[PDB]
Amino acid sequence: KNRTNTDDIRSLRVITAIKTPYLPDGRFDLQAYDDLVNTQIENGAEGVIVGGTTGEGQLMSWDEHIMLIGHTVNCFGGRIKVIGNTGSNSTREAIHATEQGFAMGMHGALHINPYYGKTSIEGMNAHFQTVLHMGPTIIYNVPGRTCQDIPPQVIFKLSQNPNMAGVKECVGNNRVEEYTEKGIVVWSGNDDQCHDSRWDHGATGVISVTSNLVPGLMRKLMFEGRNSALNAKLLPLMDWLFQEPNPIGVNTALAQLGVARPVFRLPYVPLPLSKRIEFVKLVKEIGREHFVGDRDVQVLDDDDFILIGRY
Amino acid sequence: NTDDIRSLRVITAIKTPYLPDGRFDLQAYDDLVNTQIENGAEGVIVGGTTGEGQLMSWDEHIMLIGHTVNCFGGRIKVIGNTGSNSTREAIHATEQGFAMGMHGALHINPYYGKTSIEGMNAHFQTVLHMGPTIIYNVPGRTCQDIPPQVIFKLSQNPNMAGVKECVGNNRVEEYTEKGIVVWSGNDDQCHDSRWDHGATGVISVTSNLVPGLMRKLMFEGRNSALNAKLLPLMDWLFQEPNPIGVNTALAQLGVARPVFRLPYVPLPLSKRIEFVKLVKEIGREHFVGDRDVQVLDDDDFILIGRY
Amino acid sequence: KNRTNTDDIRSLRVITAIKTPYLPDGRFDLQAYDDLVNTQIENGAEGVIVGGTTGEGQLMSWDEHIMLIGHTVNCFGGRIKVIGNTGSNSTREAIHATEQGFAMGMHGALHINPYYGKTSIEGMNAHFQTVLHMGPTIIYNVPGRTCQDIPPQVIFKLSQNPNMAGVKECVGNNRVEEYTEKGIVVWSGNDDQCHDSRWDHGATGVISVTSNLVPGLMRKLMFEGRNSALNAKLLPLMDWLFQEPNPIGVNTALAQLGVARPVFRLPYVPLPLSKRIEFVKLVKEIGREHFVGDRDVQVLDDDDFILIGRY
Amino acid sequence: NTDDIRSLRVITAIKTPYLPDGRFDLQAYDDLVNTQIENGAEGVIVGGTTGEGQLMSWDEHIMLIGHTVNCFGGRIKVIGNTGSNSTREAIHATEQGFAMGMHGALHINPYYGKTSIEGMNAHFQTVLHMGPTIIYNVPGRTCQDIPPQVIFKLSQNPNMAGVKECVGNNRVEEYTEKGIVVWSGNDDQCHDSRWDHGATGVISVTSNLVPGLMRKLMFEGRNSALNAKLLPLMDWLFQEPNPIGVNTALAQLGVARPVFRLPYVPLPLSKRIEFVKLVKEIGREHFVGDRDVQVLDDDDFILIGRY
Ligand SMILES: COc1ccc(/C=C2\SC(=O)N(CC(=O)O)C2=O)cc1
Ligand SMILES: COc1ccc(/C=C2\SC(=O)N(CC(=O)O)C2=O)cc1
Ligand SMILES: COc1ccc(/C=C2\SC(=O)N(CC(=O)O)C2=O)cc1
Ligand SMILES: COc1ccc(/C=C2\SC(=O)N(CC(=O)O)C2=O)cc1
Ligand SMILES: COc1ccc(/C=C2\SC(=O)N(CC(=O)O)C2=O)cc1
Ligand SMILES: COc1ccc(/C=C2\SC(=O)N(CC(=O)O)C2=O)cc1
Ligand SMILES: COc1ccc(/C=C2\SC(=O)N(CC(=O)O)C2=O)cc1
Ligand SMILES: COc1ccc(/C=C2\SC(=O)N(CC(=O)O)C2=O)cc1
Ligand SMILES: [Cl-]
Ligand SMILES: [Cl-]
Ligand SMILES: [Cl-]
Ligand SMILES: [Cl-]
Ligand SMILES: [Cl-]
Ligand SMILES: [Cl-]
């Protein structure tokens, strides 16, 4: 019913938080975006978050956001689950974005707790209750960005709603175990923990940044059983990706791989030259064929980069 | 002018009151600002966190700033909260706020979508040039501390009025001892910041309730007894994240309707009972409005998501 | 190429300018809307204009507009051609709406010349040139509403662009003939002329209001050859529909037929009581089975009607 | 007050000038308004058709009104164009315009999506109560005449200041003889309307160019010779739909940049040559700005769709 739709989200192991690429004037580069999503599908990504933090949703106008979701459903909705990031620190915005995203056929919603303008436990519950009934929902707990832990009592209460698909959890393995042991579906939101969460702590899978770069490896990591060697091989890449706040790393890497133009909407700027040289090295160690795109990786010069505040 | 901002000691982060349908209650808002002016508030932040700026549409945001300037601009400095975690938004909001004649802008570092030091600087540089700016460091909400090196660099811009600082007295002192203007962002620390650490003043929530006392606290010299008298009120206000407390208190005082834009909801019954007690201990005449304080029933509160 | 897509629009004979139904609080009633579109499909409507004048596009927020298009493509795009009304008297708006509507998978755009803020012939050309390249486009000439005839020299110039599908023409049969005789595809925008335009003046078909009520009859009228008797039978209905400006009639009729709630976004208000009584009579003469819905037609009381300015 | 609006004789429908990137040129805009004030314009419509209101975003619309009020509100009456063919939009724009302190609203009947007489009345009734309102009848643009019966009914509302009428002198006289304030909306008829038909004044495009002359025309009594002197300039201005002419002329006079938001484009070269001639016949000192009038090349013009 609504049951089957929620179940469809719950069964996904590899969800890519897809990067939004830009044209030199700062508008969406839909061609490059379409290529990224095709690559994700071809390498076994089962879902995509559209316009999340990795996708710089907070930098979009609301129409762009609604357009990108609609676009993703229309082009790829039969080949991958499309999960719109329709959350907000404003309940009103979360309501409208969520209903519009479902009306347009997205398969689920990702909902963060109100950040910056944080609220009480009662308010957080009230917030989630306005959107939980609209369709399959992933609750996103990322206290390092929201500055407010979504406590277990909120998660467990929400999980009585059949539309609550599960949790993107970033607090760690202990918090993951706490939920999975009670049968709540958890996706790890931390690339560098998702192997252990998957195989040691009952996590269903990952909502991933790293899969933007190496979707095949991330798929292996989530499906083919424990593999501490593969996990260790990815760690330097993951450390490189998160040395500045996401999505600064993935934006830089995808430019370097030639699959997105070197165009940044502020307030994001690329990793400096020395870090770009590091990246070339990491690609060589892991093998360029494992990374998205066909073009030889480039370091890029500082002045290849376009930084835009007005677009 | 920047110097005009720099000399302010009492800036109120004004609450935005609502009509039962969720729209702004301009009449109540006007009354709150008048009350602030009458009791010596020298500035107002319009549509900051206390003002629930993040729940406004952009037009309501621009309208409220313009409205405040038109009605009160000759009587109080009007500082628009025109910041955002989006550089594009901050740019547009700031230049529109200035074009409407606001006296200054309050800019936070990008929250949630946090960036690098270089990205933070870039962000600030797109707006700092547009007019007098207060930089807002509130790491407990942004989850990213604006480091001293950033502040010192921004302070070379003559449009940088100063810092609303929340880290504490040591960070306050680090700036004020270098002649950087600081307003404390923490009501429960602002007395000590003001008299012991060189802070110019406070950007205050508590002044929404007791503007007279907060004025005394900032102008009339050290007074640890007044400070101690206010602490229970401050502790009550901040037991849930601002502005839940001030929203609840202003409803209880009868100066704002009991109408909350989600995701905020009022303090529970027992806390409202506590509030009535605190008003009696401090004395009702010190709190905004004339109406006898009420406890209110839970069903008095309107919680709105669609407005 | 782009050729095939334009050709797909050109081959449509029955395009319904679909009414947008509302809930009592003034929001879209997507359930009722979905039922209307299903009815249109089941009775041989081949295309739908989403958010045109009949659909009260001018009363929508931009996100609602983008949402409705995306929604229509997602739910019905495989069963009917979805033509977004993405035009505007503002070139900037027309540009954004058009590209967003195409990104979301709509099959064509309907573009009016700038109304109210009318421009020169040169400006009208410049306006159309910004959006013509984005995909299959129907140019809409309705001088009775725009207060500015799109002259033949503009139409003929635009028709050199392979994305120009054809014209929704309202000036009349002579203007229709002028274009069709040169091989330009024309849809009549006047229900009470579309039979003659179709069979006597080379028009491909109709972009229709009346088909909201009697889709089967309108389909017959456009496919099954000349039929002056059927045409005469529909005339009283069409006269009733247009006695106040569209969409006042169709909003009233659909309420009366029980397929849309009696909810009007201002500045539209329903036809008065005596006209609603007339409508019941017209349904009886033509036969209720020919009209959309299953519910017995009602007159409705004045106070069944909800009129909303704030929604 | 409504009476304050009613007494205005010269209202300029002010042009909105642009920067090369398509954004508002506030500096040039401020200069245009100053010039209007200096030469006796008593009101300004902000973001009407001449002001290309239909090309603005809603925030730019709200910002420009607020800006005009803040900068010029003490020196000139500011009438926001807050109307729309959407009742919801008109409601929001009007109440936000008033909250920002505009003196009046100009409301058109719903155009393009035209409605019934009853719908038109309903539309007007949602906004008339909010403050002093000028009702705008321009059937050549709306494709729907506001009938006298509608005007007479609205005129019972004390907030109805009057009518900007474009139908002609007979319609003007029909209202003014009943003591309804009318401003002519047709520059080439406003002299006769003013002196022969009881019109109070003009809501003018031509005053953007020659504000001094338009003032004389409205205040200093019948002057068929001045009227005849202006007619060639008026005929030039309106050979393409307003504001194509005024946009072109202000670019030629050097007081606005040659930047057009689509779907407007400038008059062709030969018309710009005509313009230079008309300026010489009338005398350059009568036209806004100090710069010698230029013809400009076609490639001087920036046409923008994405701004
Ligand atoms: C994704 O969620 C949202 C996206 C956009 C909005 C925009 C609004 S709300 C409103 O009334 N106005 C007009 C005004 O306030 O004047 C807006 O433009 C609200 C929610
Ligand atoms: C105030 O702190 C809390 C209050 C309530 C809870 C709720 C819990 S804990 C748990 O495992 N389950 C599932 C079960 O036991 O079936 C819950 O629903 C947690 C924290
Ligand atoms: C080397 O790094 C940079 C050097 C210069 C810039 C300049 C920018 S970015 C932006 O939004 N604006 C405002 C505007 O474009 O109006 C600028 O001036 C950015 C980065
Ligand atoms: C406070 O600053 C801002 C407020 C609103 C915006 C929104 C924009 S910009 C643009 O082009 N569009 C149309 C579209 O992208 O569909 C928008 O809706 C940007 C900045
Ligand atoms: C369908 O086409 C459009 C829909 C919406 C827009 C909205 C705009 S444009 C812009 O800059 N801003 C922010 C500001 O101006 O502050 C907006 O909100 C433009 C086009
Ligand atoms: C200034 O008036 C006009 C100027 C040019 C035209 C263009 C025409 S007329 C016609 O039939 N065709 C097709 C053809 O002849 O192949 C045209 O392209 C019409 C009016
Ligand atoms: C019998 O016909 C009618 C009777 C009363 C109304 C009232 C309305 S409609 C609207 O927008 N507003 C403004 C608001 O709701 O704020 C009203 O007061 C409409 C029609
Ligand atoms: C000038 O008056 C208006 C200006 C803008 C609006 C836009 C609105 S209202 C609303 O809810 N939303 C969000 C949504 O519908 O997605 C909007 O964008 C309405 C009136
Ligand atoms: Cl692989
Ligand atoms: Cl308001
Ligand atoms: Cl006191
Ligand atoms: Cl049939
Ligand atoms: Cl501006
Ligand atoms: Cl003069």
Author numbering:
A (entry chain B), C (entry chain B): 55 to 365
B (entry chain A), D (entry chain A): 59 to 365
From the paper:
The DAP pathway commences with a condensation reaction between l-aspartate semialdehyde (ASA) and pyruvate to form (4S)−4-hydroxy-2,3,4,5-tetrahydro-(2S)-dipicolinic acid (HTPA), catalysed by HTPA synthase (EC 4.2.1.52), also known as dihydrodipicolinate synthase (DHDPS). AtDHDPS enzymes exist as homotetramers, with the active site located within the (β/α)8-barrel and the allosteric cleft in the tight-dimer interface located in the interior of the structure.
To probe the molecular determinants for inhibition, recombinant AtDHDPS1 was co-crystallised with MBDTA-2 using the same crystallisation conditions as for the apo enzyme with the addition of inhibitor. Diffraction data were obtained at a maximal resolution of 2.29 Å, phases solved by molecular replacement and repeating rounds of model building and refinement were performed that allowed us to generate an atomic inhibitor-bound model. Closer inspection of the crystal structure revealed the presence of four MBDTA-2 molecules bound at the centre of the homotetrameric protein, in antiparallel pairs with each molecule, which were stabilised by interactions across three of the monomers. Interestingly, this pocket, albeit distinct to the lysine binding site, shares two residues with it, namely W116 and E147. Specifically, the methoxy group of MBDTA-2 interacts with W116, E147, and H150 from chain B, while the pendant carboxylic acid interacts with S115 from chain A as well as H150 and Q154 from chain C. Additionally, we observed that upon binding, MBDTA-2 forces D117 to adopt a different rotamer conformation, which in turn, results in W116 assuming a different conformation. It must be noted that the four MBDTA-2 molecules were present with 50% occupancy. Consequently, each of the two moving residues, D117 and W116, adopt two distinct rotamer conformations, one of the apo- and ligand-bound states of AtDHDPS1. Moreover, an alignment of the primary structure of several DHDPS enzymes from plant species indicates that the residues involved in MBDTA-2 binding are highly conserved across both monocotyledons and dicotyledons and therefore should allow for broad-spectrum inhibition.
